[PDB]
Amino acid sequence: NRPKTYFCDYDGCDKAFTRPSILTEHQLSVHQGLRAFQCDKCAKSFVKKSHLERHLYTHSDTKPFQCSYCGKGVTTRQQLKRHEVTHTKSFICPEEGCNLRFYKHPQL
DNA sequence: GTCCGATCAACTGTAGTTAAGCTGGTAAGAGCCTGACCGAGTAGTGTAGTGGGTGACCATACGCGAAACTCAGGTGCTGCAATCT
Ligand SMILES: [Zn+2]
Ligand SMILES: [Zn+2]
Ligand SMILES: [Zn+2]
Ligand SMILES: [Zn+2]
Structure with missing residues (x-):
C-alpha cells in the first residue's frame, strides 16, 4: 500500500522501506x-520477536502444530502442509493421457 | 642421407602329415532366466531461519464547525432640572 520512501544509505546496499523503524531494524x-x-536454551539470537518465538518451540516436545493424520508435531503451517501432503496420493503420471496417481515418488 | 654387397629367409623346384564324420550312448563347453544382495541414483523431503508484506491501531495534522468568554451594546425608568406656560 504505502510507498517505500526510506532508503538505506550504506555502500553497496539497495533496500528501501515503508516506515523508518523498519529501516533501522x-x-x-x-x-x-x-x-x-x-x-x-542455546547460543543463537534473532532479529524479531516472532523469530525467537519459533526458535523457542524447537527446544520442546509440545510443538504448536499437530498432524491431522499421523499426529506428528511441527512448528509452522508450511511444515504441516508439506508433511500432510505426504499423507496424500500427491504424484501424477506425466505421460500423455495416462490416468494413474501415486503416493511415493519412486512408485511413479 | 647414402653407398656397397653380405646375407635370413622370400618365393621358388617336389616328398610325406593334418581334419571331417561315421554307429553310439554320454559328459563336456557355452548358456538362459528367475531369483536374491548390496551399492548407488532419482529426487522430494525435513526442520530451521531471513525477509516481506498485510493488517490493526494510533495520533497527528488541518479545516469546519460548535460552544466558550470577554467586553461593550441597549433598554427604560425617573431624579433632577428648564422650556413653555
Ligand atoms: Zn542496507
Ligand atoms: Zn536455542
Ligand atoms: Zn502427521
Ligand atoms: Zn502412465
Whole structure:
C-alpha cells in the first residue's frame, strides 16, 4: 500500500522501506551486526520477536502444530502442509493421457 | 642421407602329415532366466531461519464547525432640572 520512501544509505546496499523503524531494524541487523532477542536454551539470537518465538518451540516436545493424520508435531503451517501432503496420493503420471496417481515418488 | 654387397629367409623346384564324420550312448563347453544382495541414483523431503508484506491501531495534522468568554451594546425608568406656560 504505502510507498517505500526510506532508503538505506550504506555502500553497496539497495533496500528501501515503508516506515523508518523498519529501516533501522535493517540497519542494526545487517550493517552493524547486532540482534535483539536471545535463546534461553542455546547460543543463537534473532532479529524479531516472532523469530525467537519459533526458535523457542524447537527446544520442546509440545510443538504448536499437530498432524491431522499421523499426529506428528511441527512448528509452522508450511511444515504441516508439506508433511500432510505426504499423507496424500500427491504424484501424477506425466505421460500423455495416462490416468494413474501415486503416493511415493519412486512408485511413479 | 647414402653407398656397397653380405646375407635370413622370400618365393621358388617336389616328398610325406593334418581334419571331417561315421554307429553310439554320454559328459563336456557355452548358456538362459528367475531369483536374491548390496551399492548407488532419482529426487522430494525435513526442520530451521531471513525477509516481506498485510493488517490493526494510533495520533497527528488541518479545516469546519460548535460552544466558550470577554467586553461593550441597549433598554427604560425617573431624579433632577428648564422650556413653555
Ligand atoms: Zn542496507
Ligand atoms: Zn536455542
Ligand atoms: Zn502427521
Ligand atoms: Zn502412465
